[PDB]
Design a binder for this molecule. Structure first.
Ligand SMILES: *[C@@H]1O[C@H](CO)[C@@H](O[C@@H]2O[C@H](CO)[C@@H](O)[C@H](O)[C@H]2NC(C)=O)[C@H](O)[C@H]1NC(C)=O
Ligand SMILES: *[C@@H]1O[C@H](CO)[C@@H](O[C@@H]2O[C@H](CO)[C@@H](O)[C@H](O)[C@H]2NC(C)=O)[C@H](O)[C@H]1NC(C)=O
Ligand SMILES: *[C@@H]1O[C@H](CO)[C@@H](O)[C@H](O)[C@H]1NC(C)=O
Ligand SMILES: *[C@@H]1O[C@H](CO)[C@@H](O)[C@H](O)[C@H]1NC(C)=O
Lengths: 49, 205, 205, 56
């Protein structure tokens, strides 16, 4: 459900900034999805660094 | 001629967010015979009487039909405020309308059951420079903006769907959410009839 | 028995959009006696002459009285199209009519002035099916639909009043606006006479 | 102005409705406020309504 969607979005974002605006938009979408539905915010913070 | 109700009794009825619409002009209809095949569990009319819906003659008749579970009878109403009246299906208040909740009896054997019931739980448009969640409320006589990304049936209760709206479409994102209801032993259907008052859609004989 | 114009002189006159009506049949009237109790500032009749209004026999007589400032004498005229005729008060165009503008005399110590003069400057209906505004004009011998939300006296010049219509009533909003004119030294009133042609209402001789 | 005292009450009701979670009512209430602000020839009030929309 929400967790798989957020993980897929984060995996897509990982191969974008390294490959910046798209990374920022994907991270914003993941943050919105996490906020709309706990550990997801922690995963977002961990992926931020 | 005669108004044709055959497409209702053939094929699998769609979901509430993909309601199938029929328009009838210049024909003779017998509404009591259409409802005879079904076991009407609910029949609520606004701006017209339940007995008078099948008696008058109208300029045009609109019939939307879909698969709808009876357990969500509270959401499918003009006075309701659930997700069904916001993101799935809305009826216009400027015309006489009726909502029917019927059950496909086992003897009718050409209305195939879907896998399960589904509906759009949320449909938002995430803007870019404003970081704003603008809910997309469906208007009367139109489909939801999220029907393009929500599939024919939601796979799991709580699925999330995303579409990258192009900068031309406004950039940002279009996000949706799906919910499901368990299928019943007998298929349950929902109908919405809207009448518009030269009257040529008249009752037969 | 003489037709009794008693309620005119036994209270505070209402506003133009709440005009008070009296109906007379089978009685003898002396119209000049009534107008001799006032100071007639204006007297204009339609489809009849001011001399013959108080001499013929009529099947029925109707008198609508209200408070009306003389500074707006142009708006109160069958052939006007200001806010008074559109939204407050309109007379029938088929029967003979008369409009009288009078001033309450000092010795008439039984009429109490209101706080100010008030009227309805707009009465519109908002439709949410297309977000469209439609003005609500006033039919003959009837009150405005906005009188249920506009109070007996408008508190400030330019107030807005709102009312939400139900799904059965058609949805949307009903909105009105009020306008005020300051009270003068002597209360100024308006009367509207409608006469319909057995002619039992004959003048007293 | 008698129009600001009306739009303010409409906005308060809309804020309460959005807190309650009724999006249709919020959309309807927000429509009346801007309709009143546009009929009263008040671009400032229009901007304040937009700011209220952004803050919500
Ligand atoms: C419209 O449909 C209804 C329902 O099928 C028809 O009503 C039946 O008509 C038959 C034949 O007259 C009767 O034997 C049944 O008893 C009727 N059922 C009911 C519930 O009344 C009706 O005749 C149809 N009308 C037309 C014009 O075809
Ligand atoms: C109707 O009322 C008027 C007063 O408004 C009466 O008028 C007076 O009548 C007497 C007698 O003819 C005259 O001397 C006065 O000069 C009149 N006054 C005015 C102001 O004109 C009139 O008589 C009444 N009619 C009837 C039949 O009662
Ligand atoms: C289906 O129709 C048959 C034939 O009339 C009848 O015997 C049977 O009881 C019906 N079944 C139902 C569920 O109504
Ligand atoms: C009111 O009546 C009295 C009676 O004594 C009179 O003196 C006065 O002039 C009258 N006022 C008017 C006509 O304005």
């Amino acid at each position: 459900p929400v967790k798989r969607f957020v993980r897929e979005v984060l995996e897509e974002a990982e191969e974008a900034y390294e490959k910046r605006r798209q990374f920022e938009e994907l991270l914003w979408l993941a943050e919105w999805a996490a906020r709309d539905a706990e550990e997801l915010e922690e995963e977002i913070r961990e992926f931020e660094k | 001629v005669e108004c044709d109700f055959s497409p209702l009794l053939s094929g699998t009825p769609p979901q509430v967010y993909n309601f199938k619409r029929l328009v009838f002009t210049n024909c003779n209809y017998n509404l009591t015979k259409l409802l005879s095949l079904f076991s009407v569990n609910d029949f609520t009319c606004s701006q017209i009487s339940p007995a008078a819906i099948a008696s008058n003659c109208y300029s045009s008749l609109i019939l939307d039909y879909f698969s709808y579970p009876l357990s969500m009878k509270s959401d499918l109403s003009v006075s309701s405020a659930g997700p069904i009246s916001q993101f799935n299906y809305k009826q216009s208040f400027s015309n006489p309308t009726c909502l029917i909740l019927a059950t496909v009896p086992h003897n009718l054997t050409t209305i195939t059951k879907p896998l399960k019931y589904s509906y759009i739980n949320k449909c938002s448009r995430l803007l870019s420079d404003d970081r704003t969640e603008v809910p997309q409320l469906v208007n009367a006589n139109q489909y939801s903006p999220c029907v393009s990304i929500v599939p024919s049936t939601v796979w799991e209760d709580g699925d999330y769907y995303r579409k990258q709206l192009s900068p031309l479409e406004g950039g940002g994102w279009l996000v949706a959410s799906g919910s499901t209801v368990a299928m019943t032993e007998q298929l349950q259907m929902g109908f919405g009839i809207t009448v518009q008052y030269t009257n040529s859609v008249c009752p037969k004989l």
